Amino acid sequence: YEHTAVMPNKVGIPYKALVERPGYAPVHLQIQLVNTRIIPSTNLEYITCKYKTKVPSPVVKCCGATQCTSKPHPDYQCQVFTGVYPFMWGGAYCFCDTENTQMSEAYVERSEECSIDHAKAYKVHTGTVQAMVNITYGSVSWRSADVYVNGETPAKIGDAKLIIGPLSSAWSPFDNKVVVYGHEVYNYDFPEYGTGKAGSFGDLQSRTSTSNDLYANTNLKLQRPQAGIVHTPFTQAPSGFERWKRDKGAPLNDVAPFGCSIALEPLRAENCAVGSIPISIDIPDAAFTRISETPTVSDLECKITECTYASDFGGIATVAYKSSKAGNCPIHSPSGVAVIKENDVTLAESGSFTFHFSTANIHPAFKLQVCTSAVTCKGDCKPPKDHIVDYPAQHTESFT
């Protein structure tokens, strides 16, 4: 009636679970969970990206004490130098020849790369967003729609109002502080905007890439030009964004737990490959098939006629069904112990009818819950040739 299911989240590949119904005959309920994501409520703390010491023209005052005044920026790095005096075609820009003081100023301003294919910080609160789930069933075939995976009322789509998780598969492979960057997404601690560090991540901390404000502890040190003429060297410590290809904070699309892989995303971890999701469903009693409309199928025997061990659904097994009525019969292994791909297998009195499956067990000692009659479809299957391809459809996963 209410379809409990330990039933992981794998790619999208079709894989089944089974509604053990007791008042009426069991009906399958393929819970194929395509993905899950988390999307906690968030706040953009600062974009990061490799710096550019893009000088916004020096405030100089070669007369007496040189001044540094920021113009549409919070800070300006400015360092006085003497022993140099400006010549660039002769004359001087300096306006005292009684004080030969030279104010070199250079501030960091966001790179153009900050806009695009960039690190982007977040303070990540509490998950609130759905999980995409296919449900095929033995009274409706397929629907692949998003239904909540956390408490705020899961939607009813198909013959199944289905409560997923909470947050099982993509629990949140994110940390509190998260940077997300193209390929490698980093669940990595760093301090909020205003106090960052050059060698650590968040050397540049601009509130937005476009915005003309940041905090630039990039360890920008101007050096004294020589030979009696001005220039402005930028000496800067290794970037907190060139790390992401060298130093690692955890490159989450290559180190994620929960089977999920990651991209530039608003704190989603798409396309999981584990979940062991405890999905619990309210399927109406009507959607079930009766234990009179479908026989009690007992006095059956199942034997493989060519099982396939793999997530490959070429596994078959005749079952010499013995009906006490006779009719249709939705089937699936009890909530994954193998994945069965025949929605319904026909049952007649003393007949035999093959169904299709794929083994989620090494050998097919999987029960097949033939609408009030379990049966082991024992034998042996095709080679395990495969273990280099996607995320399985051999639900019951913990070894398959």
Binding site: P58, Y85, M88, G91, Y93, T210, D254, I388
Partner: protein, 351 residues
């Protein structure tokens, strides 16, 4: 060419700036490289010369060459120009004071034309990099392997996507700026600019002004040789101070923003995704540092870091729901569990 961003382009004057390594490890020249941008993951660098090649003051051609000899242009053919890094570049486009050029990687930038009273070239150190988008570590990508989504700068011009403040250019040395008005030292404009002129002697020195002028103190070294631009803008530099008082707004885009393109890109010679029972053995044959890493698809994270630039069968114990394997910034593999052994029967006489 395009005048759809005559904001920078038209309203750009040749800018003069000191060279720090030249002909005595110092010379006077217009050129002097600020804002070298090897920040793309590609092969192309956006550069600012101080000199404003591009047009002249008109609208036509990025293939002219206007540098400063004097405070005046020298608007000639771009054929005496040599942009180079540590080796000759191939120009992509110039717009404003900014040139985009596909350059080999290089520690320095080396520009030069003999059109001055001297060698008149300029060199400076400025950091250029290209590297893989995530994973892998390379400098400049190989000529072989996969192409994949790098940052790279445009093949075109007159763009926008980011903007750096270019709010008031000002004072630079050049005594053509500070000529003499037959007694007193006289500010001049590039092509028209609002010059907030003054000298050490008391005067107004703030305001949006070409009402600030001081003649009271006389000498080119006691006065502010300016081109306070606001309609002849140049990109702001360390060798381009601004007037001490308020900015004249002039935030201006970059028309050479990083866009996606197919770079010749990074992927060291082919991997082999091998498998045995609950294990990805991975025979690998790279010629370059490829960040291999894997992720056991269970609720285990299984991080990995290992540079593979050595041909190696490595192993990652695939958990019971598969592993994924991320062979550099070349596309992710994914692998289910169950076991294999590469097509080994596990039993097969049917029941």
């Amino acid at each position: 060419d395009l005048d759809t961003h005559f904001t920078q382009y038209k309203l750009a004057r040749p800018y003069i700036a000191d060279c720090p390594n030249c002909g005595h490890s110092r010379c006077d020249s217009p050129i002097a490289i600020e804002e070298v941008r090897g920040d793309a993951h590609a092969g192309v660098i956006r550069i600012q010369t101080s000199a404003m090649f591009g047009l002249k003051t008109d609208g036509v051609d990025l293939a002219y060459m206007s540098f400063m000899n004097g405070k005046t242009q020298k608007s000639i053919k771009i054929d005496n120009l040599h942009v180079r890094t540590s080796a000759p570049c191939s120009l992509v486009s110039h717009h404003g004071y900014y040139i985009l050029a596909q350059c080999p990687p290089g520690d320095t930038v080396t520009v030069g034309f003999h059109d001055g009273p001297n060698r008149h070239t300029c060199t400076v150190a400025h950091k250029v990099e290209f590297r893989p988008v995530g994973r892998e570590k390379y400098r400049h990508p190989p000529e072989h392997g996969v192409e994949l989504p790098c940052n790279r700068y445009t093949h075109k011009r007159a763009d926008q996507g980011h903007y750096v403040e270019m709010h008031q250019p000002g004072l630079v040395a050049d005594h053509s700026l500070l000529s003499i008005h037959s007694a007193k030292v006289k500010i001049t404009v590039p092509s028209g600019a609002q010059v907030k002129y003054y000298c050490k002697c008391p005067d107004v020195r703030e305001g949006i002004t070409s009402s600030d002028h001081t003649t009271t103190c006389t000498d080119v070294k006691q006065c502010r040789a300016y081109l306070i631009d606001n309609k002849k803008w140049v990109y702001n530099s360390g060798r381009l101070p601004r007037g001490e008082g308020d900015t004249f707004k002039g935030k201006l885009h970059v028309p050479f923003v990083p866009v996606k393109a197919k770079c010749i890109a990074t992927l060291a010679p082919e991997p082999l995704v091998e498998h045995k029972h609950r294990t990805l053995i991975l025979h690998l044959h790279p010629d370059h540092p490829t960040l291999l890493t894997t992720r056991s698809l269970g609720s285990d994270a299984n991080p990995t870091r290992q540079w593979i630039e050595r041909p190696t069968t490595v192993n990652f114990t695939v958990t019971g729901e598969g592993l994924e394997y991320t062979w550099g910034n070349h596309p992710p593999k994914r692998v289910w569990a169950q076991e294999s052994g590469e097509g080994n029967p596990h039993g097969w006489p049917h029941e």
